[PDB]
Amino acid sequence: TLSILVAHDLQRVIGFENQLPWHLPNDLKHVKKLSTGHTLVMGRKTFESIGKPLPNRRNVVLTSDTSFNVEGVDVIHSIEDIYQLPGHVFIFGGQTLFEEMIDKVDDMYITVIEGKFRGDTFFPPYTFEDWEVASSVEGKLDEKNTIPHTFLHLIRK
Ligand SMILES: NC(=O)C1=CN2[C@@H]3O[C@H](COP(=O)(O)OP(=O)(O)OC[C@H]4O[C@@H](n5cnc6c(N)ncnc65)[C@H](OP(=O)(O)O)[C@@H]4O)[C@@H](O)[C@H]3O[C@@H]2CC1
Ligand SMILES: CCc1nc(N)nc(N)c1C#CCc1cc(-c2ccc(C(=O)O)cc2)ccc1OC
């Protein structure tokens, strides 16, 4: 199974200056639940912004740098290498990789952040004419999660 895994705001912002524009612990847990024991694929910039590989899953970084070699990280140099990865593979970021993969993936796990943030990186446009809503779950607000958000599982028609 090949999935997209992304959080974007009302205008499809996913990032600002190498970081996430919002602080939302429930979504990180959502990411952890979904991807633990599976595979995350990410472009080089996304990985460097994270800093280190995420625990308890395969971390695959796509780059053209043939010197790239980080411990805990597997490296691929072609989009085409993605299709060779076994198991449940999540396309994790960033804008460049989302643009390359959105027409190829089976489904998308989107967290819609219900706000308008300043961004410099965006999720590509997509229409619900192409995607069935398998589920839509409102996130709970609290002490530490103060921005409305909705977990979507979209499946290609
Ligand atoms: N929530 C997110 O997903 C976030 C992502 N990070 C943002 O990516 C922002 C803008 O740059 P972007 O091009 O979107 O970076 P992504 O694709 O991770 O990674 C780009 C790199 O992936 C690699 N790449 C993507 N496609 C290919 C490819 N087809 N072949 C070889 N390398 C690939 C190539 O890396 P390289 O310069 O070291 O060779 C490319 O420049 C960049 O500002 C990062 O900050 C955000 C923080 C939030
Ligand atoms: C975690 C935000 C997020 N949510 C969803 N639904 N899909 C995604 N693809 C990303 C993402 C991302 C990139 C990113 C992840 C993280 C991150 C940090 C910690 C954990 C964790 O503790 O599980 C997960 C992701 C941190 C920074 C960062 O870019 C700056």
UniProtKB/Swiss-Prot annotation:
NADP(+) binds at residues 6-7, 14-19, 43-46, 62-65, 92-97, 100, 121. Residues 1-156 form the DHFR domain. Pathway: Cofactor biosynthesis; tetrahydrofolate biosynthesis; 5,6,7,8-tetrahydrofolate from 7,8-dihydrofolate: step 1/1. It comes from the Bacteria. The keyword NADP applies. GO terms for molecular function: dihydrofolate reductase activity; NADP binding. Its EC number is 1.5.1.3. It catalyses: (6S)-5,6,7,8-tetrahydrofolate + NADP(+) = 7,8-dihydrofolate + NADPH + H(+). One of its GO terms (cellular component) is cytosol. GO terms for biological process: dihydrofolate metabolic process; folic acid metabolic process; one-carbon metabolic process; tetrahydrofolate biosynthetic process. InterPro entries: DHFR, DHFR-like_dom_sf, DHFR_CS, DHFR_dom. CDD domains: DHFR. Key enzyme in folate metabolism. Catalyzes an essential reaction for de novo glycine and purine synthesis, and for DNA precursor synthesis. There are two DhfR isozymes in S.aureus, this one is chromosomal and is sensitive to trimethoprim. Belongs to the dihydrofolate reductase family. This is Dihydrofolate reductase. It comes from Staphylococcus aureus. The gene is folA.
